[PDB]
From Swiss-Prot:
Recorded topology in the membrane: Multi-pass membrane protein
Record topology, Cytoplasmic segments: 1-5, 54-64, 101-108
Described purpose of this protein according to its UniProt entry: Chaperone that facilitates the production and integration of integral membrane proteins into the bacterial lipid bilayer.
Main location: membrane
GO CC, alphabetical: plasma membrane
Positions in the Extracellular compartment: 21-29, 80-86
Uses, biotech or industry: As a fusion partner, can be used for high-level production of other membrane proteins in their native conformations, including many eukaryotic proteins that have previously been intractable to bacterial expression.
Stored Pfam families: Mistic
This protein's UniProt keywords: Cell membrane, Chaperone, Membrane, Transmembrane, Transmembrane helix
Compartmental location: Cell membrane
Subunit field text: Monomer.
Identification of the protein by name: Protein mistic
Gene designation: mstX
């Protein structure tokens, strides 16, 4: 992202800055810090990166891909909800997770 990669390390930057700092990008307005950030890069960044990865950032050698990101949205969605906005995040995450970014795994393994 800041070295060589472009978006390959950006999606992780948006997921690492959005709900990976809890202020560096979580205290931008809350509603705008989740939406603006859910569209900022998640817009074409997700639709793109996803169309390039569709694993949640697997290509990127970090841990795997599931925890690489899931661990982020998990710790948040398990600690507060995703960014302390669960109230509205549930939709922001459900949207940025149902948009087919989670892992294009039928929404998430099993729907029902």
């Amino acid at each position: 992202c800041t070295f060589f990669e472009k978006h390959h390390r950006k999606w992780d930057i948006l997921l690492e800055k959005s709900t990976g700092v809890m202020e560096a990008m979580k205290v931008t307005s809350e509603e705008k810090e989740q939406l603006s950030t859910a569209i900022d890069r998640m817009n074409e960044g997700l639709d793109a990166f996803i169309q390039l990865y569709n694993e949640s950032e697997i290509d990127e050698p970090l841990i795997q891909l599931d925890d690489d990101t899931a661990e982020l949205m998990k710790q948040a969605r398990d600690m507060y909800g995703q960014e302390k906005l669960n109230e509205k995040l549930n939709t922001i995450i459900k949207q940025i997770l149902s948009i087919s970014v989670s892992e294009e795994g039928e929404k998430e393994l099993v729907p029902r």
